[PDB]
Structure formats: structure tokens, C-alpha cells
Design a binder for this molecule. Structure first.
Ligand code: MG
Ligand code: ZN
Lengths: 52, 163, 190, 198
RNA sequence: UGGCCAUGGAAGUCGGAAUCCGCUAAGGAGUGUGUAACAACUCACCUGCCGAAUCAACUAGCCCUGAAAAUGGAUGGCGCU
């Protein structure tokens, strides 16, 4: 239904992300802290939930 | 056997365990069962006849189907033959205390076990196979008044007769 | 603490002519001129060697927040030399599930019309940055090429048409649609 | 750890240098664990297989230790991915065995091509699935009674040509692996004399 | 080594007493993705490339998050870096 390398290239911008637990911010997948002042750099991070 | 059913030289051997007790469902109902002229009742009877007395414990059964019958061969596993040489009987019915008596001390049977090893483990002479088989078991692991840590490393016997 | 000196040198090749009016550097060569005003950055920019072979950047008595700027000045100088000599070419592919995204340039590459994104009727017009040329390449189905000299302008122009094609009020993990940057290279390789 | 292991590694390399005076410098490239176990089961009795590392520059100490000169040829040539094969019997027979010890080693996308790759007329062995991945490259594939059949021998990958991702995936689906050599020998050390592996 | 209780399923895999050898350069009877079970993707160690200061845990300062009230509001005000 879609080309797989272009699907992975869309995954790199839409799904391969880190999400903070405090402010729910979308972060780069190599992150150990958060950017936002509003969460105080909480560093409680999770991977973004992959689609089934 | 690709198009619908053409047995030309069917000698398919696959890996299969749990052939000592017939169990409840026997794990034979899926696709391996009805494909290959293997019935369930005669197959369970022959599997029980191969997993008959001496020994009644769960072993590995490799099966050969010559279009009408199943020949089950038991490959000699070290833990399975140690648990078979463990003192019988303990299956159920005053079980639960538990499986780990361990009063065998593997006296003169590991020589024949090393003779019946099927050239596996990428081995040198039997001085390494002794240290493999002295640590692979998990019941008593050594003689009754010894420890398997720093005693198996010094063995001055059994270097020639094992091959 | 205050570190007494942080220095870094940039060896420019012979195809590049650079000069500086204070902290205002100008880099000219084959593809054109590029200026950058490093006022309010507060470093020392010396330019040494016969025919100005290297650009040396100094920071004197700066703590960590201003020691972190010597390498970014060096990186902007590398990117400007790369844009003058080899240029910047950003390739970006149109990923769609069902509706084919129709992209058409209008003047040369300045105004870009995006149509049929998620079956919408609203056309998406994007003005590019001055100096960025947009094109539809050959031997590839749905793919845009952004050519230019300034990496800032080319990548900002890529980010504009990447953020123009976003999916609203849906699951974007399922709706993987839009024009996404796939390759970042130069115009010529040399 | 990290001291006794290094001392044991030094004792092992000096024991192999005192045991086998002839060594082969081969490639330790892309290989599997079962593949290395098959290589060891082939060279079980005679040869000894060893990994080279940065502490293989103790041949200078071996030459300093009052025994053997002319060991400085082996010192710059520890480059790449290095394996040592210590043996005693013969050079050209064990070289022919290492040549015949090639591995199928299903290919990867991005490697170089040693020879030309052809596709014989053989079906995929599957049902009526999609033929777009085979027809996008220019391969004559038809559907004759379920199986996808190739109707013309087409030379896809030439010598020195880069392997594409789609053609690599269709070669992995067709289960054809020509992009393997196994181990590549570089230098043959023979009791002080250095020969050319030709 | 489908090692071992778990049969309702553990060939690393819901879990727990166990918890080492061989090839050895190297895989802990295993960190996850995930299964009626599998299979498969994938982390200790090192080599090919850059060649000198780096890593980890605590702890004390200032600042930030935590920190939301109703008339417009107060380091006293202006303001101050
Ligand atoms: Mg919704
Ligand atoms: Zn946050």
C-alpha cells in the first residue's frame, strides 16, 4: 500500500520520538532530558507508542 | 507431496519433546499431525510404547514416518539421562517433595555417555567434556561430600578410554 | 571558570575568497557571494596566511556559554564555504497513501502550489526564501529538489513545505502523508 | 578481569608462537556464529583460529627476546579485520582448503560485486502474490498456475556494480547468494619467508 | 540446553529456587521488541577509521519546574542586570 523505505522515512519524522511524562513533549529519539522549561527538564521519558 | 498428495521418499524427521506421558491433549492436533498419514490414536499408542517403562520421564522423541508407522528414537541428553538414572519412581501420587534427591554421584556411566556423544560441543579430548558434564547438571552436581567448583578441574583419569 | 583562550582555525581552499569588515564576513567564489554579520557574537576574527589561507577565531576570557560559540562560528564558516563552492541540494519525497500530492512551481521555484493533500480542496501556496530555487527532478515520481547557497534559507524553505503538509486532528502515526526531507547533499560533488 | 585476561592472552599468543611457527593472515569479515563453528570443526585438529587485535604488536617483543630476527614484516600488516591461522603441515593444501571453505552467506545491500549475477528460469515456489517488486526492475515474470515464473535469463548485477536494495531483497526472496567469499588471505608467513598468495 | 518447577505455556522470554564449562575473541541458563509455542530483529568484549583527557554516583551554592483567586498592586515607589 506504500513503499517501505518511504514508510520508514515517514516513521523517522512521525513515530521515532521520545515523550516526556510531565509535559508530553515530542522529543528526538536520542534524548535523555527534555527541552521545556515548564516541566523543569524532568528526564522521565518514554518511547512514542508504535502503531499496531 | 507439493501438489495434493504424492509420497515419494517421505522420511521427514523433526524435533519433538514431551513423549513420556500421554497427557491431556498430547500436542498432536495441529498441522504436523494430520499431514503425513500420521493418525492420533495409533500415534499416541506408539509414543506411549516408546515412552514406556525405563523411563517414564519426559524425553526427546525424533520421529521417522515410513508412510504407515512412526519410529521414535530418543537422543541421549545429559540432563535427561541423569534424571533417568535418578532413583525411580517419582511421577505423581506422593510427588511434591520434589525432584531433587540426588544420591547417584555419576560413578561409571558418564564414560559411556561420552562415548555416545554425537560429536557435538566443538570439543577437544575428554578433559573439557568432563568439565562440561560436571557443571551441566543441576541436582547434586558432584559426590555427596564434595563441591563442583574447584574439584572437577583436577581429574587424573579417563583420558584414553573415553574415545 | 574563565578559560584564558579558545582558538580555532579554518583552512580555506584556493577556490574561495573571504574577507571581513570587523565581525562582518563575506565569502565569494564560484556560485556567488554570501555575507554574515557576526556582530553580537563577540569573538576575535583574524585572517592570516598569504592570500588569506586561514580564518582564525578567538575567544578570550569566556566561560562555558561563550566557549560553546567558537565551534558554531567555525561550523557556519564551513557551511558558507560549502554553499559557495559546492552549494546545497535538499531532496524531499512526497509520501502519500492514496491521494497523489500534486506539486507545481510557478515563477521559477519561488511560489510552490501543493494540491490534493489528503483530498483537500484548499491549495497550499508557499513562498520560498530569496535565493532558493525549487524544481521537480527527473527519473523520480514525486520528489522536490531545493537548490541554493545559504543552508539557512534552503533548510528553512524545506521546513516550510514540510510543515505545510501536516495532518490535522488524526492519528499521524497511521496517516503518514506529506513532503518529507530524504537527502541532504550538494549541487556538485568535486 | 582486564589484567589476568590480558596476561592469559599473552600466554596464549606466546604458546601459539612457540607451538606453530607457520601462520596465515586471513580475513575475519562478515560471518555467522554457526559459520565460525563450522570453520572450527573443519580446522579442528591441525589449525588454530585466532583473532587479531591491537595487542598483536608483541611480535616486536618476540623479536627483542633474543631468538628470531626478520619479524618486522608482520608488524605494519596488521590492518583491517585480522584472523590468524596457526598450522604446521602445509601451505598450499591448507590454502586450498580455506578457498574451498566458502560460505553461502545470504547477501547484504551495499556490498561490491565480485562477479556477474544471473537468474535461472526457476519459480518462486509460492502462490499468486504481487509481482510488482519483480517487474519494477525489468524482469520478465509471469503467473502460470500460481507460481511466479521467470521467462528470460536476465543479467541484473554486473562486475563492480552497486547492489540496490530492491534487487537485494528479491535475491534474498529467491534465495540466491553469490555475494560471498568467506575469508580473504593477505600475507603468508613461512618460517621467516614471506610469499605471495597467488 | 525443549537444562530446571511451571502442562495452561518458557528451545533467554507471565514468574521463582537455580545460575558453569566448550569454541574461546564471544554471548549473562540473558536487557527489550513478542509469543496457544516458535521463528526473527537486537545489548558485555575487540578490530578498520579521529587520536587526549574522559566516565559514573553523591553533595553543596544561585536560578528554574513544583507554585492556582477573585477591585488594579506593590523589594515603599521609580527602576535596577
Ligand atoms: Mg480522531
Ligand atoms: Zn518534559
Amino acid at each position: 500500500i506504500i513503499e517501505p523505505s518511504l514508510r520508514q522515512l515517514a516513521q523517522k519524522y512521525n513515530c521515532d520520538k521520545m515523550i516526556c511524562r510531565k509535559c508530553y513533549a515530542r522529543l528526538h529519539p536520542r534524548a535523555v532530558n527534555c527541552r521545556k522549561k515548564k516541566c523543569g527538564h524532568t528526564n522521565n521519558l518514554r518511547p512514542k507508542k508504535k502503531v499496531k | 507431496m507439493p501438489p495434493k498428495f504424492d509420497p515419494n521418499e517421505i522420511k521427514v524427521v523433526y524435533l519433538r519433546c514431551t513423549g513420556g506421558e500421554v497427557g491431556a491433549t498430547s500436542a498432536l492436533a495441529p498441522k504436523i499431525g494430520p499431514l503425513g498419514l500420521s493418525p492420533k490414536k495409533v500415534g499416541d499408542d506408539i509414543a506411549k510404547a516408546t515412552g514406556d517403562w525405563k523411563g517414564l520421564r519426559i524425553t526427546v522423541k525424533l520421529t521417522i514416518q515410513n508412510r504407515q508407522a512412526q519410529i521414535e528414537v530418543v537422543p541421549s541428553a545429559s540432563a535427561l539421562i541423569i534424571k533417568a538414572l535418578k532413583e525411580p519412581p517419582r511421577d505423581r501420587k506422593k510427588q511434591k517433595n520434589i525432584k531433587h534427591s540426588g544420591n547417584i554421584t555419576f560413578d561409571e556411566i558418564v564414560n559411556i555417555a561420552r562415548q555416545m556423544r554425537h560429536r557435538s560441543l566443538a570439543r577437544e579430548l575428554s578433559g573439557t567434556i568432563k568439565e562440561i558434564l560436571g557443571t551441566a547438571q543441576s541436582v547434586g552436581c558432584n559426590v555427596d561430600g564434595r563441591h563442583p567448583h574447584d574439584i572437577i578441574d583436577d581429574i587424573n583419569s579417563g583420558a584414553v578410554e573415553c574415545p | 571558570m574563565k578559560t584564558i583562550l579558545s582558538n580555532q582555525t579554518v583552512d580555506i581552499p584556493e577556490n574561495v575568497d573571504i574577507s571581513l569588515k570587523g565581525r562582518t564576513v563575506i565569502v565569494k567564489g564560484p556560485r556567488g557571494t554570501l555575507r554574515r554579520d557576526f556582530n553580537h557574537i563577540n569573538v576575535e576574527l583574524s585572517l592570516l596566511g598569504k592570500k588569506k589561507k586561514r580564518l582564525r577565531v578567538d575567544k578570550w576570557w569566556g566561560n562555558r556559554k561563550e566557549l560553546a560559540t567558537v565551534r558554531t562560528i567555525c561550523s557556519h564558516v564551513q557551511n558558507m564555504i560549502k554553499g559557495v563552492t559546492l552549494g546545497f541540494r535538499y531532496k524531499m519525497r512526497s509520501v502519500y497513501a492514496h491521494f497523489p500530492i500534486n506539486v507545481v512551481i510557478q515563477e521559477n521555484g519561488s511560489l510552490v502550489e501543493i494540491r490534493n493533500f489528503l483530498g483537500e480542496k484548499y491549495i497550499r501556496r508557499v513562498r520560498m526564501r530569496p535565493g532558493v530555487a525549487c524544481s521537480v527532478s527527473q527519473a523520480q515520481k514525486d520528489e522536490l529538489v531545493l537548490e541554493g547557497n545559504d543552508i539557512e534559507l534552503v533548510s528553512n524553505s524545506a521546513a516550510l513545505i514540510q510543515q505545510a503538509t501536516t495532518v490535522k486532528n488524526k492519528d499521524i502515526r497511521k496517516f503518514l502523508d506529506g513532503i518529507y526531507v530524504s537527502e541532504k547533499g550538494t549541487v556538485q560533488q568535486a | 578481569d582486564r589484567a589476568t585476561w590480558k596476561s592469559n592472552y599473552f600466554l596464549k599468543i606466546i604458546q601459539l608462537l612457540d607451538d606453530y611457527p607457520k601462520c596465515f593472515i586471513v580475513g575475519a569479515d562478515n560471518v555467522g556464529s554457526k559459520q565460525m563453528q563450522q570453520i572450527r570443526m573443519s580446522l579442528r585438529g591441525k589449525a588454530v583460529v585466532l583473532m587479531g587485535k591491537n595487542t598483536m604488536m608483541r611480535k616486536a617483543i618476540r623479536g627483542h627476546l633474543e631468538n628470531n630476527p626478520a619479524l618486522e614484516k608482520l608488524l605494519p600488516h596488521i590492518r583491517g579485520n585480522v584472523g590468524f591461522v596457526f598450522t604446521k603441515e602445509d601451505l598450499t593444501e591448507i590454502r586450498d582448503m580455506l578457498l574451498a571453505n566458502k560460505v553461502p552467506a545470504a547477501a547484504r545491500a551495499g556490498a561490491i560485486a565480485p562477479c556477474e549475477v544471473t537468474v535461472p528460469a526457476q519459480n518462486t515456489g509460492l502462490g499468486p502474490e504481487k509481482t510488482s517488486f519483480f517487474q519494477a526492475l525489468g524482469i520478465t515474470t509471469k503467473i502460470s498456475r500460481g507460481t511466479i515464473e521467470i521467462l528470460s535469463d536476465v543479467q541484473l548485477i554486473k562486475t563492480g556494480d552497486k547492489v540496490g536494495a530492491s534487487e537485494a531483497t528479491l535475491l534474498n526472496m529467491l534465495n540466491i547468494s553469490p555475494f560471498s567469499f568467506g575469508l580473504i588471505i593477505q600475507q603468508v608467513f613461512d618460517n621467516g619467508s614471506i610469499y605471495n598468495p597467488e
